[PDB]
Write a protein that binds this ligand. Sequence first.
Ligand SMILES: CC(C)CCC[C@@H](C)[C@H]1CC[C@H]2[C@@H]3CC=C4C[C@@H](O)CC[C@]4(C)[C@H]3CC[C@]12C
Ligand SMILES: CC(C)CCC[C@@H](C)[C@H]1CC[C@H]2[C@@H]3CC=C4C[C@@H](O)CC[C@]4(C)[C@H]3CC[C@]12C
Lengths: 291, 306
Amino acid sequence: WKSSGALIPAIYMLVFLLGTTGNGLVLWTVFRSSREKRRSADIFIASLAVADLTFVVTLPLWATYTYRDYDWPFGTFFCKLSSYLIFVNMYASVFCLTGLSFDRYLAIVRPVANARLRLRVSGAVATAVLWVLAALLAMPVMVLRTTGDLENTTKVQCYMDYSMVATVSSEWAWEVGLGVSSTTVGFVVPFTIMLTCYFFIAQTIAGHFRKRRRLLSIIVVLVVTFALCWMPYHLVKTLYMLGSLLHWPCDFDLFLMNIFPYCTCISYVNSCLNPFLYAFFDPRFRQACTS
Amino acid sequence: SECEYTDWKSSGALIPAIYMLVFLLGTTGNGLVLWTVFRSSREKRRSADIFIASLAVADLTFVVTLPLWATYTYRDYDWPFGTFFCKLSSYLIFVNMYASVFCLTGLSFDRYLAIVRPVANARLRLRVSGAVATAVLWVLAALLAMPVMVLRTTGDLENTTKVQCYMDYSMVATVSSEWAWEVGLGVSSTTVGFVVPFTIMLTCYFFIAQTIAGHFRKERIEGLRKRRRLLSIIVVLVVTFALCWMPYHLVKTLYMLGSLLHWPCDFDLFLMNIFPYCTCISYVNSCLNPFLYAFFDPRFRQACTS
Ligand SMILES: CC(C)CCC[C@@H](C)[C@H]1CC[C@H]2[C@@H]3CC=C4C[C@@H](O)CC[C@]4(C)[C@H]3CC[C@]12C
Ligand SMILES: CC(C)CCC[C@@H](C)[C@H]1CC[C@H]2[C@@H]3CC=C4C[C@@H](O)CC[C@]4(C)[C@H]3CC[C@]12C
C-alpha cells in the first residue's frame, strides 16, 4: 500500500546530506579537541560517526536504487560494498554504544575497578577489536551479496545469494541462520549487556540520588534513539521469518512486507539523527558550533 | 588502412598490475605525506606545505578510482561500474591533472617570490592568501574538468557486449562537427594543463636560476641545503611531472595534429600502440611523488623516524 512515489529516495537523499554534514562536524569536534581533554567516550563517538559516514556515502546509491524501481546500475562490487558497509554500520554502532554503556557502568557504579581495567586495556585496543569484529561479522554479507536480473524484467536487483554455500533445500536454513545471528549479534546480546549495565547504573544512581549526568543523558538518548530506529527493522525481519516458519496469516505477512521499507528507512535515518542529538544535549558540540 | 592492425604485442596483465601497484603505493604514501604535513604545527606549516597537501589530496582522489581503471583494463576494456562512476573517475583524473599542475605552478611561483625578490613576498602574501590561492585553484580545476563530467558516457560500442567508458561529443556537437569539439577540448586541456602552466613555471625558474647564478657566478656543484631544500624538491617534482605527463600530452597532440596533417600510417599506429603506456606513466606519477619526498627534503624522512 501507499506506493509513496519518491518518499524513500527523498529521505535517503536528505539523510545523505545531513548525515554527511553532521558527522563531519562531530568528527571535527572530536579530533579538534586536545588529547589531554580527549575523554574515553570520545573515541567511541568518533567511531560511531565514522560508521555513520561510511554508510551515508553509499546512501545515494540506495536512493538511486529505490528511485529506479529497484534497478542497480553500479555493478556487483558496489552491491557487495554497500551491503557490507550497511552491516558494518549496524555492528560497529551497536558495539560502540555497548562500549559507551560499559564505560558508564565502570565509572558510575564502581570506578575503582574501572581504574584497573583502564590500566589493563586502553581505548584504542577496544576500538580496534570492535572494528575488526564488525568487519568479520559483516563478511558473510560481502561474500554472499550479489547482483542479478531477477524475474527477467531487465531490472538488476542487489540481493543475497545463498546458492553459493547452500542448496535449494537448505537455503531457508542458511537464510534464517544468518538473519537470526545478525539479530542476536546486532540487537539482542548488545541490548542485553547494555540493559544490565544500565540496570546496575540505575540502582547505583538511586543510591546516588550532574557531571556524570551529562554523559549518561547523552549516551542514554543515543541508545534509546538507536533502539527506536532499529527495533522496527529487527522486529519486522524476525517476525517475517517466524511467520514463514509457523505459517502466520497472509494479511499480517503483507503488512510486514509493506512496512519493511519504512523500517529500513528509519534504521538509515538514525545515522543522520545522531548529530542533532549531540547538538541538543552535548554542550561541547554546541561549543564547537559557536567556536 | 595499411596500419591500425594491433597495439604492438599484448601487454598481458602489465597495465592492470601497474595500476594496482600504483593504487597501493599511492594510497599509502599519499596518506603518509598527508599525515606528515597535517601533524606538523600550523605555525610551523610552511607556505609550500599547503600546496603539498593539495597535491597529495589530488593524488589520493585519483588513486582511489585507479582500481576501477585496473578492472576496466583487465576485462579487455569493459566497464561494469556504470555511467556515474565513468563520469566520476574520468573527472577525477582530469581534476588530479589540473590540480597537480596548478599546485606545482603555485610552488614554483612561491619559490620565485622567495628567491628572486624576498621583499615583495610579504606584500604578495598580503594581497593573496595561500588558502585563498588553493581554493581558487581547486575550483578552477573542478570547473575545467566539468566538461569531462558532462560528456562522459558508457556505451556498448562495436556492437559487442563490452561497455566502454568514452567521450560523447554528440550532446554538444553534430557528427560533422564532432572533430571540432574533440580537437578544441584536447587542445584546451593541453594548453591549460601542460603548456601555459609549464610556460609560467619555466619563466619563474629562469629568473630563479639567474638569481641563483648571481651568487653562483663561478661553477659550484651542489647548493647550500638550508635554502636549497624546497627548491630542489619542487624542481624534482616538476621534472618528474614533466617526464610522466609530457609523453601523454605529446602523443595526444600528435594524434590530433595528424588527424589533419595526415602523418604516415605507421607513425599513427605507433602512437596508438604507445598511448596506453603513456597513460600508465602519467598515472605512476601520483604514487611516485611520495618516494621523491622520502629522498629529498628531510621533513618526510624524519617524519618516519618520529
Ligand atoms: C563489477 C565487478 C566485477 C568489479 C570487480 C572489481 C574488483 C576486481 C576490485 C574492485 C576494487 C578492488 C579492491 C580495492 C581495495 C582493496 C584493498 C587492498 O588492501 C587489497 C585489494 C582490494 C581488496 C581490491 C581487490 C580487488 C577489487 C575488489
Ligand atoms: C548509473 C546512474 C543511473 C546513476 C546516477 C546516480 C545519481 C542520480 C547520483 C549518484 C551520486 C549522486 C551525487 C552524490 C553526492 C553529491 C554531492 C552533493 O553535494 C550534491 C549532489 C551530488 C552531486 C549527488 C548528485 C546525484 C548523484 C550523481
